[PDB]
Symmetry: D2
Subunit: 76 residues, 4 copies
């Protein structure tokens, strides 16, 4: 379906994405902007989060398989 580059633009626009090939069920990613994160100092940058399979919110770490996969989809 969707590539990771396409899934990123969906994330940069505020929607939630996921991979059908993931082992965990009901997981998704969402991107929070630097302005929303604050709510010559260093400023925040965009951060991708992950809602895990056990209903927990962590900072997301992409696997090599995630980045190369073609099975991304939008959370409906």
């Amino acid at each position: 379906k969707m590539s990771f580059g396409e899934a990123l633009e969906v994330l940069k626009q505020g929607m939630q994405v996921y991979r059908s090939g993931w082992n965990g069920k009901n997981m998704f990613l969402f991107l929070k902007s630097s302005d929303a994160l604050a709510s010559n100092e260093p400023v925040f940058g965009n951060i991708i989060f992950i809602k895990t399979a056990d209903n927990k919110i962590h900072a997301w770490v992409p696997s090599q398989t995630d980045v190369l996969a073609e099975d991304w989809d939008i959370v409906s």
Copy 2:
């Protein structure tokens, strides 16, 4: 000096760590707890951040070299 497992316990205690082998200068990590992040719903988990070389705050992604390295140190 310090291993990554030792550097993690320093992070879990609120201090800042870094690797001397990193290419970027003046970078460090810090861990924010789930309680501090909020400020059958999914709850936050601990998140490791990184102050980058260009004074930006991102979610940290460990390289394989980071995890196996022995050159960790505490920010003084």
Copy 3:
């Protein structure tokens, strides 16, 4: 000059990409597909494997001239300063 998604297309075509915003110098990524690994280590039998054991691996030629498995950071994934090694 290009995003990470565009750099992935360049990576999947056997080319090398890099970020000008990286701290280290003379670094680049390259992709070893499952078929490339099966062929390079297959001794002429790789075309008959159908299901190789090694998945796709992205490598990074680091600043120390070593070769590591590349871990995509959120800064790299969200960056817009990717380019092709010329």
Copy 4:
């Protein structure tokens, strides 16, 4: 049962570790040190390399019985449910 730092000690000793909290089944990590890679691909000359080109690589035996380069997630790094493959 053990933390990630303890699992790293087990990894650096040639043993395999895993997380009971992982979603996939029958998965484990294993480490290929720089010396192991230089020896296994060196054809009896690996002891004379001094500075090998390949760094240490952590691999993951994934649920599909494939072998990938393992990317340490923040959940894995902070987890406390690591154990040794028996």
